[PDB]
Design a protein around this motif. Structure first.
Motif, mmCIF file in Angstrom:
data_model
loop_
_atom_site.group_PDB
_atom_site.id
_atom_site.type_symbol
_atom_site.label_atom_id
_atom_site.label_comp_id
_atom_site.label_asym_id
_atom_site.label_seq_id
_atom_site.Cartn_x
_atom_site.Cartn_y
_atom_site.Cartn_z
ATOM 1 N N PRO A 66 44.484 64.276 -14.741
ATOM 2 C CA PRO A 66 45.835 64.020 -14.224
ATOM 3 C C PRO A 66 45.906 63.354 -12.842
ATOM 4 C CG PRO A 66 45.263 66.351 -13.910
ATOM 5 C CD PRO A 66 44.101 65.696 -14.629
ATOM 6 N N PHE A 67 45.703 62.044 -12.790
ATOM 7 C CA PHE A 67 45.704 61.326 -11.498
ATOM 8 C C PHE A 67 47.127 60.999 -11.079
ATOM 9 C CE2 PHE A 67 41.018 60.123 -11.958
ATOM 10 C CZ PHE A 67 40.617 61.097 -11.075
ATOM 11 N N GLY A 68 48.093 61.070 -11.987
ATOM 12 C CA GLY A 68 49.499 60.922 -11.570
ATOM 13 C C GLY A 68 49.872 62.045 -10.611
ATOM 14 N N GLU A 69 49.381 63.254 -10.906
ATOM 15 C CA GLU A 69 49.787 64.503 -10.207
ATOM 16 C C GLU A 69 49.251 64.479 -8.772
ATOM 17 O OE1 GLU A 69 48.406 68.283 -11.790
ATOM 18 O OE2 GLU A 69 49.576 69.419 -10.282
ATOM 19 N N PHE B 87 48.072 61.466 -6.889
ATOM 20 C CA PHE B 87 48.398 60.302 -6.025
ATOM 21 C C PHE B 87 49.906 60.106 -5.896
ATOM 22 C CE2 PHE B 87 44.467 57.663 -5.420
ATOM 23 C CZ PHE B 87 43.586 58.530 -6.029
ATOM 24 N N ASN B 88 50.663 60.482 -6.922
ATOM 25 C CA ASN B 88 52.126 60.257 -6.928
ATOM 26 C C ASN B 88 52.836 61.595 -6.782
ATOM 27 O OD1 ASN B 88 52.100 57.445 -6.971
ATOM 28 N ND2 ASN B 88 51.905 57.406 -9.223
ATOM 29 N N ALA B 89 52.181 62.588 -6.178
ATOM 30 C CA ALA B 89 52.786 63.907 -5.881
ATOM 31 C C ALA B 89 54.029 63.732 -5.006
ATOM 32 C CB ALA B 89 51.800 64.815 -5.205
#
Ligand SMILES: *[C@@H]1O[C@H](CO[C@@H]2O[C@@H](C)[C@@H](O)[C@@H](O)[C@@H]2O)[C@@H](O[C@@H]2O[C@H](CO)[C@@H](O[C@@H]3O[C@H](CO)[C@@H](O)[C@H](O)[C@@H]3O)[C@H](O)[C@H]2NC(C)=O)[C@H](O)[C@H]1NC(C)=O
Lengths: 114, 196
Positions: free
Chosen positions: B4-7, B9-11
């Motif tokens: 889950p790289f959305g969680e 970098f785009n936190a």
């Protein structure tokens, strides 16, 4: 997500008292760091009173005037603000830091007239 | 599925450096290729592993450490650094195998008249151990005289605000930093790339 319930504040006469509270929900607040910071308008935000797990800790002008308490059971920190002076007029923000993030309250305005 | 790289970098929330966030990433597949190529990230430097060879490699654990610092202070997110961030806020190990990703976030993490939400620790008795997190708020004793919980003459409150204004030059601007921490053990592997 984690939320903080700021309550307290308003106008007071000089020499008046107040009590702020900040109750924390959304996470594990075991051994956490809770307390208040204030920002008078145009000034930097500065700290007031704070408890990390080791030590509680007070700003220079509020020693003897303000008192910080918490019960870990209700996950709430309290700020008993006695002997208020018009210098103490600021927006007061609670700070809660868990194992994952530092969180801030929205800010309760406290205003003292002479 | 994919890690889950959305969680990370785009936190919606990024932490202050003294109170940095560690999300653990295990038991998934990760394409680092799209991250390295992206010009969103100004800083993408890896230590002990090539950025090309990221999708080939296999690691036991990968941790995502994320925090907000000043633009000057991005230099200190490297093994064997010293300075206020490396000594008192976030310390990498000497044998650090992993990647440091950072980008400018002046438009989100500054408001007009200062953002006082992001802090950094200015003093500590010892330097931090690697990956150690200090959220203590005792008054630092800078002198001979003991502190009695009060900010005094040689008694100082340890957390200082950045106070990010948009009118600050690029060195004093907010940068978001993500640290990817690859740990290799004699344990079995959990996270490999697409090509393995
Ligand atoms: C981190 O964030 C960037 C920004 O994207 C935004 O936040 C994401 C979590 C999603 O909610 C996005 O919908 C949102 O815009 C992500 O990069 C971006 O990916 C989106 C697609 O998800 C791109 O949109 C496309 O744009 C092209 C042309 O611009 C169109 O042809 C496509 O049809 C589509 O609309 C967006 O442009 C792109 N932005 C950048 C900076 O490249 C990124 O995916 C996300 N990181 C992760 C791993 O989720």
């Amino acid at each position: 997500q984690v939320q903080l319930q700021e309550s307290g504040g308003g106008l007071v006469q000089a020499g008046g008292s107040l009590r702020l509270s900040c109750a924390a929900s959304g996470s594990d607040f075991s051994s956490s760091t809770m307390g208040w910071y204030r920002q008078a308008p145009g000034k930097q935000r500065e700290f007031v009173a704070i408890s990390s797990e080791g030590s509680t800790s007070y700003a220079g002008s509020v020693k003897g005037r303000f008192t910080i308490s918490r019960d870990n059971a209700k996950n709430t920190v309290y700020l008993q603000m006695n002997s208020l002076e018009p210098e103490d007029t600021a927006v007061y923000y609670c700070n809660v830091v868990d194992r994952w993030y530092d969180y801030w309250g929205q800010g309760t305005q406290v205003t003292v007239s002479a | 599925n994919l890690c889950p790289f959305g969680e990370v970098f785009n936190a919606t929330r990024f932490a202050s450096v003294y109170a940095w966030n560690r999300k653990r990433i295990s038991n998934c597949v990760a394409d680092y290729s799209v991250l390295y190529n992206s010009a969103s990230f100004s800083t993408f430097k890896c230590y002990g592993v090539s950025p090309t060879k990221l999708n080939d490699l296999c690691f036991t654990n990968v941790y995502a450490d994320s925090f907000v610092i000043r633009g000057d202070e991005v230099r200190q997110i490297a093994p064997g650094q010293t300075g206020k961030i490396a000594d008192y806020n976030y310390k990498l190990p000497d044998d650090f195998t992993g990647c440091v990703i950072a980008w400018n976030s002046n438009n989100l993490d500054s408001k007009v008249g200062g953002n006082y939400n992001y802090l950094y620790r200015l003093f500590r008795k010892s330097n931090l151990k690697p990956f150690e997190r200090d959220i203590s708020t005792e008054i630092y004793q800078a002198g001979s005289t003991p502190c009695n919980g009060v900010e005094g003459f040689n008694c100082y409150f340890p957390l200082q605000s950045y106070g990010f204004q948009p009118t600050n030059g690029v060195g004093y601007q907010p940068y978001r930093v993500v640290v990817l921490s690859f740990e290799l053990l004699h344990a079995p592997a959990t996270v490999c790339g697409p090509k393995k």
